Amino acid sequence: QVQLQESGLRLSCAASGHTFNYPIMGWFRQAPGKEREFVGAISWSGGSTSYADSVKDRFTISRDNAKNTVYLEMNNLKPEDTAVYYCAAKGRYSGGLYYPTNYDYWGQGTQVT
Amino acid sequence: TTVFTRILDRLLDGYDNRLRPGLGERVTEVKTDIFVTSFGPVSDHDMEYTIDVFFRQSWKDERLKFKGPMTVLRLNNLMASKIWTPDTFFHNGKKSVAHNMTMPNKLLRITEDGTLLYTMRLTVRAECPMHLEDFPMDAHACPLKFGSYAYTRAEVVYEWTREPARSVVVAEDGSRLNQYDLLGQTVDSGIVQSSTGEYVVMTTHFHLKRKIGYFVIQTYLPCIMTVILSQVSFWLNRESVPARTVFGVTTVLTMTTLSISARNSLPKVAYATAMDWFIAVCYAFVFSALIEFATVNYFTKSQPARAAKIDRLSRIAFPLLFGIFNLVYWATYLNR
Amino acid sequence: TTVFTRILDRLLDGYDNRLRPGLGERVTEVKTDIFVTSFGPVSDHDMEYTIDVFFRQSWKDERLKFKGPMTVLRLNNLMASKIWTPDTFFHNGKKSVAHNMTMPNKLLRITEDGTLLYTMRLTVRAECPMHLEDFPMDAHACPLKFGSYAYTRAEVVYEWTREPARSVVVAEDGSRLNQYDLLGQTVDSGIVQSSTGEYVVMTTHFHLKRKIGYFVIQTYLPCIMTVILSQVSFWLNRESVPARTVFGVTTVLTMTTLSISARNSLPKVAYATAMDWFIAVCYAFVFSALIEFATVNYFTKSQPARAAKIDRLSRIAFPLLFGIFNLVYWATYL
Amino acid sequence: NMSFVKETVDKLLKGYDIRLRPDFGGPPVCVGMNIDIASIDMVSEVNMDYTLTMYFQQYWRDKRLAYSGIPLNLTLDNRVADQLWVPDTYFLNDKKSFVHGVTVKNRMIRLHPDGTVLYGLRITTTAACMMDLRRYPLDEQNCTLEIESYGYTTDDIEFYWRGGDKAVTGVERIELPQFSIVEHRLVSRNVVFATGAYPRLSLSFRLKRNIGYFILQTYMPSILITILSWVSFWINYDASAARVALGITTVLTMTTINTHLRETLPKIPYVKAIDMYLMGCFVFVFLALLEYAFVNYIFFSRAAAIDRWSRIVFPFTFSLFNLVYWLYYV
Amino acid sequence: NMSFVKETVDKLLKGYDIRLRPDFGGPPVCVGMNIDIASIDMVSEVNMDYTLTMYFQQYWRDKRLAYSGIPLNLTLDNRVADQLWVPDTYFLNDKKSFVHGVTVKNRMIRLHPDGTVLYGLRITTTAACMMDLRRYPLDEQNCTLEIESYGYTTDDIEFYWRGGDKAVTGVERIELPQFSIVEHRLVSRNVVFATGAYPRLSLSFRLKRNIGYFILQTYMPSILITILSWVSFWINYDASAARVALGITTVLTMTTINTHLRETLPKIPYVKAIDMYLMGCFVFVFLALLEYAFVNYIFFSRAAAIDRWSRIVFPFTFSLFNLVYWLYYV
Amino acid sequence: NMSFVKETVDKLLKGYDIRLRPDFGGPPVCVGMNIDIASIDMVSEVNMDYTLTMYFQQYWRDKRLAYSGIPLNLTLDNRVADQLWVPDTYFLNDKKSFVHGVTVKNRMIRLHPDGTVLYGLRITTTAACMMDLRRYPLDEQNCTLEIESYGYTTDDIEFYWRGGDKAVTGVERIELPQFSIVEHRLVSRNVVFATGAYPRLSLSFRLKRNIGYFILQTYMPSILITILSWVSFWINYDASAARVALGITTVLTMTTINTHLRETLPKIPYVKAIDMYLMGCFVFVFLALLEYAFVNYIFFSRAAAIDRWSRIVFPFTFSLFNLVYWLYYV
Ligand SMILES: *[C@@H]1O[C@H](CO)[C@@H](O[C@@H]2O[C@H](CO)[C@@H](O[C@@H]3O[C@H](CO[C@H]4O[C@H](CO)[C@@H](O)[C@H](O)[C@@H]4O)[C@@H](O)[C@H](O[C@H]4O[C@H](CO)[C@@H](O)[C@H](O)[C@@H]4O)[C@@H]3O)[C@H](O)[C@H]2NC(C)=O)[C@H](O)[C@H]1NC(C)=O
Ligand SMILES: *[C@@H]1O[C@H](CO)[C@@H](O[C@@H]2O[C@H](CO)[C@@H](O[C@@H]3O[C@H](CO[C@H]4O[C@H](CO)[C@@H](O)[C@H](O)[C@@H]4O)[C@@H](O)[C@H](O[C@H]4O[C@H](CO)[C@@H](O)[C@H](O)[C@@H]4O)[C@@H]3O)[C@H](O)[C@H]2NC(C)=O)[C@H](O)[C@H]1NC(C)=O
Ligand SMILES: *[C@@H]1O[C@H](CO)[C@@H](O[C@@H]2O[C@H](CO)[C@@H](O[C@@H]3O[C@H](CO[C@H]4O[C@H](CO)[C@@H](O)[C@H](O)[C@@H]4O)[C@@H](O)[C@H](O)[C@@H]3O)[C@H](O)[C@H]2NC(C)=O)[C@H](O)[C@H]1NC(C)=O
Ligand SMILES: *[C@@H]1O[C@H](CO)[C@@H](O[C@@H]2O[C@H](CO)[C@@H](O)[C@H](O)[C@H]2NC(C)=O)[C@H](O)[C@H]1NC(C)=O
Ligand SMILES: *[C@@H]1O[C@H](CO)[C@@H](O[C@@H]2O[C@H](CO)[C@@H](O)[C@H](O)[C@H]2NC(C)=O)[C@H](O)[C@H]1NC(C)=O
Ligand SMILES: *[C@@H]1O[C@H](CO)[C@@H](O)[C@H](O)[C@H]1NC(C)=O
Ligand SMILES: *[C@H]1O[C@H](CO)[C@@H](O)[C@H](O)[C@H]1NC(C)=O
Ligand SMILES: CCCCCCCC
Ligand SMILES: NCCc1c[nH]cn1
Ligand SMILES: [Zn+2]
């Protein structure tokens, strides 16, 4: 099991528990109208990052394994970024990064505007 | 001549190899025989053993009767692919090879009354579950089980060709066993109830006993003389502290090297073997000798009478303790 | 669109791939060319070397003449199985493999005049007979011999496409050699007699020279340091019997461990190599350095005048003798 | 009649397209999976995989293969599998897998009058499972086998475990040399790719390393050599030869122990608990010798006070280190 | 309803010649490629290779396979690939490879109404990348996969990365204990051989080696042994047995360390960065023993002055050597 | 005219029955065998086998393949082997083997106008080799290659060597690394199995192990260390530290030598001749150390007399041990 917390520019998500079974941490976004979309992904081991096209350079995801945290740094903020952000964890063999269904554990949302 | 070609073509017309002899009339009885050409090496590290065999199966097929000049016709292995043959497998096989040098190593013989004999040369790398508590004094009964894959008991039943004990024949010349003695074999038959159904299983256990002389000369003797060397330290004079100190600590180093080699040889199993207990006891003796020297050196300058008493008691006691341990160990592990 | 299908059908009716071109008219002349994509690792233990190549063959087949819109048909490898191709094989190969990455790595090209190019991708693991007396200073000429398996000299004859020297081409980036330097190659042709008959054999010797830096920094220099240590024993005071004794015996143990370290680098051969001689000489020097102390200690008190003489003579002698040994060895083997 | 069965089979196979999924335009085919584990041979830490032999059965339904007039279940020769459509199942974890092939290809096709088909295979698979060896050799691994269809999405095919939790058999009987299978779990899910959503099954074992062998062989030699390094202290401080020889020989013995356990460890290049313990013991013996360095420096330039201080401190410090190590890694 | 697809497939493969690529006389056929990296199992410095498992998708246009009246895509059985033309791709830097075949040949063919074909394979390849281990274990490697067309020149076939930089995915799935991927790159170009010019697609990875294991296991013991060699200076000058035993046993321990890291580390026969450090430490330990020999000759044959000078020099010189070493390679 | 040859071979193969042998009801067919040994690549004592690369040629008469009007020998493609009857000859003592396949399956078929067929293969065979290594490394090994017909009894087939003693060639061009082929023999005999009597040919070699390597590289270090052991007698009886260090360091050196010639020498778990020599040397060193301990107990607890007795006896006893060892194994 994996327990996730989110601390609300700069934002972070801490994870605890069976972190090895779920090495990929995914950041998703959801507005009131649109469904959950993919923002970014980071490996717990190696710190390899993948980004969405819209936030390829504006946002960054980094890793800090000492505290077991993933840091989402936000720059060049637009009003379209106003949404709730979700931290989730994906198993080793669960397909692509871009699909919310593949992610098992979902953290509590964090609303930003 | 062309008579035999016509006969073989008259056999292979309307013959469905997918079906079984007596698919809805009776049970297909397959009489089996094994000739072990060589009993390959037994790998205790992988818990397996290789065996080279001529595997012979005989059954009856009324669809393959003929009345020709020859009572029995001996065909190449090509015919066997065009004829139904039993789907025998090895239940405890890890990976086995049907040899194929210059031809598939198979023979098919058809008798006039429809009796088929099918033989093939195999090298089976069967798995042998091993309990190495008594290593290197352990003995094993490695199994070899075979039976049909798809056909249940109600469809195909295996039998031994002539007699159970005489239906598995081991060649005299072919042994291929380095550190084992083959104490005969025991054959039997039974039924295994899987999820799909009940299957006839023919089993053969080969009884193996490990040879001990290699470990006697190579591990046990150097450890014994190393601990005896540690015992010799007590007879040196007490005033030569650097001599006895070097002796004890470098003897600990020697015991460490020998023990490390012993661990390197033995297979990786997660419990204590007899060799492990022997090595642990010897290492404990070697450590205890140096601790005793340390106490004697502590008491050598103050109340030296106690130091002399300790040295004498150590001389009398430690070799006696090691001898008692050796006698108990050997009487335990060799009288089985 | 469909013209080429008709042409290919017209080529493969009446064709017999069992019969070579000119079965009873002429000698099939096969023009061979090799492009060595990589020269794989050379294994002294197994006395073998690996080489990954584009093996090219070319010959004229009059049965495959055609006229059409295209001068050359660049057909896939499926066509290769339906026509006669030479049965080339490597005489000194051990276990080669024709690569099959998503298809057989072959190409077939048929020209209108009957000419036919057939190229293949191979990884040949050939055997290199090595004489390792001068190990690690040895140098080898590893061979690559190939020719037809079934067709004799009177049936199939092999030739080089453009020139013997310029045929075998080695890629500039395909080195794959750790402890060897490839000093070019020499290409040749010949005839090998056999029980079945005479056969044409194309030969290519690749000249290899070992690199010595690994052994120099790993085996030779530690042994030189240990013997130098064994020789510093003479300068220590002769009254320190335990010190010289432990020093000498631990130096002997250090030299034994170094010899065991150099054990695995050697391959198993029945003759002493250069490094074997070096190790033996160093080990004997370490032996003598402590036999010297033994005799000195024996004469330390009964004949004290003599012991100092032995120490001085040994001090002057042992470094000089090992120095001349190094000079002779490193001049002979280089 | 026997020939009647032949005619029935020929009629069934005639006009049969192996390339077309059953009910090609209809709903997806429900394939029920079943496994009987024969053995889990190796659990390789260095390669981070494990070998597993299984009888893998797949049940599905094909109306094209329905027959009447033959009450028996037609158990046909395995070669008929070439002429039928079989599901597109494969394993993602396998580094190398093969179907056993001796005396026949170890396959079974069993047809039924209802049209349901059973397809059994004996498969040996070298499945890849990651191992968190940070706490090695006190660790709890979780190695899994993942089953999925390569070609057909969830709209075309559907997987499930036949028998629920009883689908997999043989875990209770199989025993490993170095591990114990605490639990096995069956999971079914759907995984979304770029191509589409595919079905997936998962058989996950939890392995707990048995700890009765590393203590017997790894920790105790280091602990006893450290104890001898402490025995160095109780020797009188004027006997420089004895103390220095004991300390440096203990250092040499620890070096030998470290090198040969490196030879007899999984040899994965990243730090583990046993490496930390061995380096702690090595640092302890090194400090034990450097303590005599201090003592000899001070006495020739009280010293027994430092020896008594070391006598009380070194065992206590090592006990504290052992307690911290055995609490952190448990 | 289902037969109609059968005649559609039959007439698609009727008159279809696999020997001719699409547009045999026409312009070159464009083939897009995607790769999904399942894992990189091994990276061996002994063999200078790495094992890569991947889903390799190819995508091209074949007008001969166009069909009408069936708007849905035909996801056909893998065996259909035997009857179709395929781009004949290969990897130049391969050593040994295979396509996974457990329960089915792990291939997929998907036809589209406009004649477009999507081919897919699951391939394990032991590719060769040469490594410059002069900086080992402080080194950064570059390993590449070289996709190429064998039989078809640049005027017969054209390669491109479908999706551009997004063509290759699954680099997040790569998880090497002793390496970390700092970057991956896609390149497309043409390469000229004697037979013609061919298209080339290169997938490159830069790997940085993690040095925690090496620092823990190789560097620190050789430093502690050197410190123990320095301890000989503080002891005495007349205690010859103790100092000589310490120095020569330190030399023995260094030789043991060098041998047992030689025979346990990967065997690459030429100089490396770790070898320079080890030989420097060996030189320091050897010179400590030579220092005591010089002191003994001076005294028995000022000694305290030499001891003090060695005390204030050997740590300083070793720190200088470490500073030079750890700046050259970082 | 290739058309004439084409129709000739077509009518030859038309009506040919591969299932039936030549003279299926007639007398047995005689197959004559030739061998050309390219090399004996490997000889392993661990696996008890040797690798052998060989050109294996078989000659037999077949009335069904006689042709007229074509004076030349018809050398056909290797694929013609699929359509013809070839003898089923297997190597009984084979473990792993194959026919080479570089650019073609390395086969040759050569027909003659009178029906004679020459069938040649290039075969690599890892044949079993039961070695009696009790005298190792001073042993001679006789291991052979045994060719037999699998399916055809002596009533159906007959084997013989063509050219008699000249049937096998290439033996004297073989240069093994640490072996020397002394003699080779060819035998022909009938072997009775349960199924029937079959013909067997046996090609036997006698191998002598070269000894220079072993005497230099294994024996000599353990003889010179035993000689180091005797320096203990010439030092003193009062000098305790030096003599104890010498004795135990000799013991440790012998232990290290034995434990490493373990892993370098091949793995054969049973006692050998080298083991006896190493054990004798170890016993001699152990006895020398016991001799010093006895002297020390006598003096501190006549000593010079025992030292002189040991000086005279130990070299003499070791020389006697060497004599009885070398006489028993030569
Ligand atoms: C060893 O390691 C493996 C791999 O990490 C662990 O397995 C995972 O296993 C657990 C089971 O313990 C799985 O949990 C389950 O997933 C099932 C399928 O999933 C759905 O996923 C989401 C859920 O939001 C949706 O898309 C959709 O609903 C899917 O159906 C669920 O059906 C399971 O549900 C049960 O639990 C939940 C929560 O308590 C209940 O609400 C349900 O009603 C039901 O009772 C469950 O959620 C997990 O998916 C696996 N993940 C993988 C394979 O990536 C092993 O547990 C671990 N330990 C071992 C083997 O001992
Ligand atoms: C390596 O080691 C193997 C195993 O020990 C040796 O093998 C044996 O070799 C000997 C010869 O060296 C063989 O003996 C010969 O067998 C021939 C064939 O024998 C069978 O057939 C005859 C009828 O043809 C029967 O009568 C007989 O019973 C067998 O059934 C015989 O024809 C030979 O006879 C000749 O020599 C003998 C002895 O000199 C004479 O008395 C005869 O008159 C005749 O001239 C001979 O007996 C033996 O069969 C082999 N055995 C096996 C199991 O292979 C290798 O020789 C050895 N090689 C090397 C190089 O060391
Ligand atoms: C690992 O090492 C590899 C080899 O050293 C690195 O690959 C080289 O990578 C660079 C950077 O990506 C490439 O440079 C580009 O090539 C493209 C295409 O080149 C060709 O086509 C043009 C068309 O005109 C032609 O002019 C060129 O000569 C080429 O024939 C160019 O468009 C770019 O401008 C740039 O030059 C190299 O081509 C490439 N070479 C090889 C042999 O692969 C790789 O980058 C390294 N890995 C990492 C992670 O950096
Ligand atoms: C297979 O056919 C379907 C239609 O039956 C194609 O559908 C596409 O639909 C998705 C849904 O959003 C779009 O993103 C794609 O752009 C559509 N295709 C095109 C060409 O525009 C589907 O693309 C086909 N499969 C493939 C691999 O192209
Ligand atoms: C065809 O085959 C025959 C039979 O091998 C060849 O004739 C033998 O050739 C060898 C070598 O030239 C001679 O030593 C023999 O005396 C010949 N006769 C026999 C019975 O072996 C013949 O040369 C081959 N070629 C042709 C064109 O006939
Ligand atoms: C074995 O060899 C025969 C011909 O000798 C061939 O027909 C068959 O396909 C081969 N089988 C295998 C598994 O190699
Ligand atoms: C490649 O060669 C192998 C033989 O090694 C053969 O079985 C296979 O059909 C060939 N083609 C492909 C696509 O693998
Ligand atoms: C092995 C050489 C010994 C030299 C002894 C010197 C005697 C004067
Ligand atoms: N079954 C995996 C199909 C796939 C993977 N990647 C893209 N498509
Ligand atoms: Zn060692």
Residue numbers in the entry:
A (entry chain F): 1 to 8, 405 to 509
B (entry chain D): 12 to 319, 391 to 418
C (entry chain A): 12 to 319, 391 to 416
D (entry chain C), E (entry chain B): 8 to 308, 419 to 447
F (entry chain E): 8 to 308, 422 to 450
Any passages from the paper?
Type A GABA (GABAA) receptors belong to the pentameric ligand-gated ion channel (pLGIC) superfamily, which includes mammalian nicotinic acetylcholine receptors (nAChRs), serotonin type 3A receptors and glycine receptors, as well as other non-mammalian homologues. Here we solve structures of extrasynaptic GABAA receptors to explain the molecular mechanisms underlying a low Po and marked inhibition by Zn2+. In all the structures, the single β–β interface is occupied by megabody 25 (Mb25), which comprises the immunogenic binding domain nanobody 25 (Nb25) fused to a cHopQ enlargement domain, which is required to randomize particle orientation and break the quasi-five-fold symmetry for particle alignment. The co-ligand histamine, included to boost yield, also occupies this β–β interface in all the structures, binding deeper inside the crevice in a pocket homologous to the two orthosteric β–α GABA binding sites, as previously described.
The divalent transition metal cation Zn2+ is a non-competitive inhibitor of αβ and αβγ GABAA receptors. We observed non-protein density that could accommodate a coordinated Zn2+ ion at the extracellular end of the pore in the GABA–Zn2+–receptor cryo-EM map (2.79 Å resolution), which was absent in the GABA–receptor map (3.04 Å resolution). The Zn2+ site comprises a triad of His267 side chains from the pore-lining M2 helices of the three β3 subunits. The τ (far) nitrogen of each imidazole ring is positioned approximately equidistant, 2.5–2.9 Å, from the Zn2+ ion, and at approximately 120°, despite the pseudo-five-fold symmetry of the pore. This location is consistent with its non-competitive mode of antagonism and voltage dependence. Replacement of one β-subunit His with Ser (as in the δ-subunit) or Ile (as in the γ-subunit) in αβδ and αβγ receptors reduces Zn2+ sensitivity 50-fold and 200-fold respectively, explaining the basis of the exquisite subtype selectivity. Zn2+ nullifies the GABA response by non-competitively plugging the extracellular end of the pore to block chloride conductance. GABA binding at the two β–α sites induces realignment of the corresponding β-subunit ECDs (chains B and E) and clockwise translation of the β1–β2 and β6–β7 base loops above the transmembrane domain (TMD). The motion is equivalent for GABA and GABA–Zn2+ structures. Thus, occupation of the pore by Zn2+ does not hinder the ECD transition in response to GABA, as previously observed for picrotoxin bound in the channel of αβγ receptors.
